Design a protein around this ligand. Structure first.
Ligand code: L2P
Ligand code: L2P
Ligand code: L2P
Ligand code: L2P
Ligand code: L2P
Ligand code: L2P
Ligand code: RET
Ligand code: RET
Ligand code: RET
Ligand code: MYS
Ligand code: MYS
Ligand code: MYS
Ligand code: C14
Ligand code: C14
Ligand code: C14
Ligand code: TRD
Ligand code: TRD
Ligand code: TRD
Ligand code: UND
Ligand code: UND
Ligand code: UND
Ligand code: UND
Ligand code: D10
Ligand code: D10
Ligand code: D10
Ligand code: DD9
Ligand code: DD9
Ligand code: DD9
Ligand code: OCT
Ligand code: OCT
Ligand code: OCT
Ligand code: OCT
Ligand code: OCT
Ligand code: OCT
Ligand code: OCT
Ligand code: OCT
Ligand code: OCT
Lengths: 231, 231, 231
């Protein structure tokens, strides 16, 4: 395990996701409100899935070698397995907060699936120049998602409770900033142009992942917006 | 890319799915009705997914070699990845049109999953005679789906709005004819008996795919059946 | 096929799932009640999926070799493909019976996904001692599911119809006993410590699978709890 310099960040990531999972699990024990239960379920599952995939990367299972540029390049494929399930759960948290219509939710989840799926294909593609074609398609799917979060959701939040409108606005802003960093790190890291070494890349993704999951969850689950308006 | 004679049909397929995706995306921009949004979301996602998988076939990612009959046989596995997601979306379009009950929808999607999954296993099976066992099981799942579309849905459409009944009937008929061709092409093509060469097989699937997705979508999204009855 | 001593149990399993599938399919033909249709759909799909995966194991497709302990160890990976889809369907049968809230259903299905997914990783892991780390995480996800079935569902059933409360209690008890055997068989069988040989392991899983699917389904589909209260 320690044979890879990036192991320290995989281990820290595993620990922080594990701790985040346990914290949300305990916190949600005292919850009976049916609406709050939905948000706790979604939000606890996110770091639990990430915990398993960080562990698989730490132990070496979630790593494969991909030939491109005349080299055997270490590619952590387990990231995409994580993201396939956790990024639509994160979007679902946002969509339920603002009572999004079903068509909009399906558009978001579908675009998200395309985003992660094409990122996976790009990560595993052996023809170097083609990796960036997949990156571009994935990034276009991301831009669609960000567009919807701003010009379909923000003006939906404003007709809702003030506490859900303010909580949505904060989580929207956190999401757009954090999620936009992922394609940049991929592009300059070992999957793309290879300018930033894998150990630093792994650190960067770990900070983004913990912030986008445990950070996000801490903000959401401390808000009164997750509860039905009750006396 | 041009090293494979079937590349021209993969390229045309990619282009037509891409163009179809953009057309539906633009067309649905001016839509606020919650019901119509569902149909636009579902129907736009279908060629978008197909676009990505056609591209993966064009670039060579979605192709593998399978030993059977003492030969290395080129198998485009990306078709099944496409179909796994797009065929239940197509069925969902039909089921929502007639306000199908939840049990019926689950039966359809489940049978569809079995249909595509067993087709994939058959496509990748190395014992030649066993490929046709999987083809038979998949075809039985197809026949179940077609049965339900006729003797569970058609008489559901007739108690609904005339515009939804007439639109459903047309899309049902398009679906049954087009979908029934797929097992025949598989059986006589490079996956099955090998009587029709891969380049012609690829052409045939491209015509079926564009018709079943973009053709289907053009009929559906031009109907007033996708809108709630409103003043 | 007969080259593997466990083939007889794979063949019997295939037959019993096939027969169970046909029986439930015929039985549900005379059903119009929308609630009952849901239970028939879910419950018929379960042995149908299991039939396909038992067949893939019989024909040899669903088997791979995994190096650990200095040996090539036969691992039937198709079990996890089965279980990935059938165990959440089984939980859905239980959850719908007691009209579980959406948050609880998502927690169950999510924990179940983690349970099966980590079992799959453990089954395919090449470092022997690490296989048991994945077994432990999977078992913890199982224990969560069993906890919810007892201390979240049982007291939900009691405020419902007596026929649904009594049917739920029986199916809950069947589920907890049968499902708890699976991690034990894995641990002592060819995936784990290797004390029980593969042919006996295969027998054990076949008895558990038929009981947990066809047995379970026979109890559920003969109950009046699956019908809406109607005059
Ligand atoms: C009911 O609605 C609220 C339940 O949501 C909360 C439900 C949770 C989503 C349940 C899912 C967590 C499972 C219990 C997962 C089990 C293994 C976990 C990964 C635990 C890992 C952390 C520990 C090992 C440090
Ligand atoms: C509604 C939304 C969910 C829409 C989803 C959007 C989605 C369509 C976007 C594209 C997804 C698609 C790229 C998934 C591809 C998975 C694939 C990378 C798995 C690895 O297999 C690739 C090659 C080795 O590189 O296998 C070597 C050759 C092997 C023989 C491969 C044969 C097995 C195939 C992988 C079977 C395909 C199954 C499905 C792709 C399962 C989807 C997995 C998940 C990653 C989407
Ligand atoms: C809101 O409900 C309506 C939105 O549906 C319409 C929503 C669409 C389903 C959004 C999904 C499309 C994504 C934007 C996919 C991005 C890449 C596409 C494959 C674009 C490819 C076509 C172009 C490259 C020729
Ligand atoms: C409700 C509905 C959805 C019901 C669904 C119906 C469904 C049950 C029908 C059968 C689906 C099942 C056949 C999927 C099999 C996928 C498999 C072909 C992927 C390729 O792996 C096959 C061999 C190489 O040929 O791998 C070589 C050996 C490797 C070590 C394989 C180990 C990895 C396994 C593939 C893990 C299994 C994961 C699940 C099958 C994911 C499902 C993928 C999708 C195609 C259904
Ligand atoms: C409508 O709601 C009730 C339908 O549920 C019942 C619907 C069923 C879930 C339909 C799914 C079964 C498909 C017809 C599967 C076809 C192949 C089967 C595996 C048949 C195998 C058994 C036989 C070959 C012995
Ligand atoms: C809401 C709930 C559903 C939550 C779900 C919980 C879930 C997160 C729990 C963990 C699931 C995760 C372990 C699935 C891993 C599948 C993996 C074993 C498939 C086989 O690939 C493993 C190695 C060979 O051993 O591939 C060799 C290297 C290859 C290059 C691998 C590259 C292809 C990757 C497999 C692509 C990943 C796609 C997704 C994992 C699809 C999920 C399949 C299913 C088994 C969950
Ligand atoms: C918890 C993990 C999260 C929130 C991950 C988010 C990841 C993305 C938004 C990834 C986006 C990518 C692209 C837009 C193109 C390049 C490849 C990706 C997959 C890194
Ligand atoms: C957009 C793509 C569509 C509508 C594809 C439909 C495909 C089928 C109905 C495929 C059916 C098959 C069988 C019935 C058995 C042989 C294998 C298949 C998968 C080709
Ligand atoms: C129809 C099949 C059923 C009901 C299978 C149930 C399987 C399980 C509950 C498996 C549990 C496992 C663990 C808890 C850890 C070890 C690995 C598994 C996957 C066997
Ligand atoms: C969105 C953030 C992307 C920028 C990442 C900056 C990383 C700077 C680290 C120094 C680069 C290491 C190069 C020498 C090894
Ligand atoms: C459902 C349509 C299946 C029939 C396809 C007919 C294809 C005819 C093309 C000629 C066959 C090529 C054989 C000589 C290369
Ligand atoms: C939950 C049941 C697990 C116990 C399984 C008992 C199997 C006993 C069979 C005898 C073991 C075979 C060892 C000699 C080959
Ligand atoms: C490819 C995996 C996509 C599914 C991820 C799980 C999250 C799905 C959330 C469903 C949202 C509800 C839509 C109506
Ligand atoms: C194996 C992939 C199956 C899922 C495909 C996505 C479409 C699912 C549509 C869900 C229909 C709603 C059922 C209640
Ligand atoms: C990884 C596969 C998980 C999906 C299995 C299919 C069963 C899903 C049942 C959905 C229950 C409804 C939740 C709201
Ligand atoms: C186009 C929608 C406006 C809100 C999205 C902001 C786009 C940020 C760009 C992210 C950088 C990705 C490379
Ligand atoms: C049995 C249901 C009647 C409607 C379905 C028509 C079946 C068409 C056969 C398709 C050919 C597949 C090989
Ligand atoms: C902790 C919840 C109480 C009900 C679950 C009973 C646990 C049975 C243990 C199963 C054995 C697995 C190794
Ligand atoms: C070796 C790099 C070749 C450049 C490929 C860039 C493709 C980016 C596509 C953006 C439309
Ligand atoms: C080499 C071909 C052997 C014939 C197999 C046909 C099987 C079809 C099954 C239909 C019930
Ligand atoms: C070779 C076996 C080494 C023992 C591993 C047991 C790990 C079990 C983890 C339970 C917390
Ligand atoms: C990680 C295993 C958890 C089993 C005990 C249940 C914890 C309490 C959860 C309350 C919903
Ligand atoms: C509760 C702490 C969980 C941390 C387990 C994984 C950390 C890796 C240590 C090497
Ligand atoms: C908008 C046109 C999209 C076409 C891109 C793929 C066509 C392949 C050209 C070689
Ligand atoms: C209807 C009987 C189904 C049995 C088919 C599979 C049994 C395997 C026989 C070798
Ligand atoms: C993006 C950083 C999130 C910070 C989380 C802090 C949570 C405290 C309530
Ligand atoms: C099956 C062929 C479909 C033809 C689509 C034409 C759409 C015009 C409205
Ligand atoms: C766990 C054993 C189940 C027994 C099923 C018998 C069904 C008869 C109604
Ligand atoms: C990591 C366990 C958290 C302890 C409880 C925190 C207050 C709910
Ligand atoms: C008003 C919300 C500001 C949140 C910005 C957080 C940036 C990481
Ligand atoms: C809305 C601001 C987006 C900031 C992008 C930051 C990418 C590192
Ligand atoms: C391909 C872009 C379509 C242009 C608009 C067509 C009329 C909505
Ligand atoms: C009355 C509907 C006829 C549609 C037939 C289309 C055949 C491709
Ligand atoms: C309902 C008519 C079906 C026609 C099947 C055509 C197969 C090529
Ligand atoms: C296996 C076929 C079952 C025959 C009908 C049983 C009574 C519904
Ligand atoms: C009162 C229900 C008892 C069911 C026990 C079944 C054990 C297999
Ligand atoms: C509730 C009793 C569980 C029995 C476990 C049996 C495991 C073989």
């Amino acid at each position: 395990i320690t044979g890879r310099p990036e192991w320290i960040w995989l281990a820290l990531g595993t620990a922080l996701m594990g701790l985040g999972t346990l914290y949300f699990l305990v916190k949600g024990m005292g919850v009976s409100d049916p609406d709050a239960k939905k948000f706790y379920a979604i939000t606890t599952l996110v770091p639990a899935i990430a915990f398993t995939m960080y562990l698989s990367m730490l132990l070496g299972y979630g790593l494969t070698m991909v030939p491109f540029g005349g080299e055997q390049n270490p590619i952590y494929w387990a990231r995409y397995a994580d993201w396939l399930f956790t990024t639509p759960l994160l979007l679902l948290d946002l969509a339920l907060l603002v009572d999004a219509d079903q068509g909009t939710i399906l558009a978001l989840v579908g675009a998200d699936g395309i985003m992660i799926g094409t990122g996976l294909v790009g990560a595993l593609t052996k023809v170097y120049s083609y990796r960036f074609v997949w990156w571009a398609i994935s990034t276009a799917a991301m831009l669609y998602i960000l567009y919807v979060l701003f010009f379909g959701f923000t003006s939906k939040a404003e007709s809702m409770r003030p506490e859900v409108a303010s909580t949505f606005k904060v989580l929207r802003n956190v999401t757009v900033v954090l999620w936009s960093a992922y394609p940049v790190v991929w592009l300059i890291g070992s999957e793309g142009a290879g300018i930033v070494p894998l150990n630093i890349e792994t650190l960067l993704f770990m900070v983004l992942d913990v912030s986008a999951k445990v950070g996000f969850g801490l903000i959401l689950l401390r808000s009164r917006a997750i509860f039905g308006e009750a006396e």
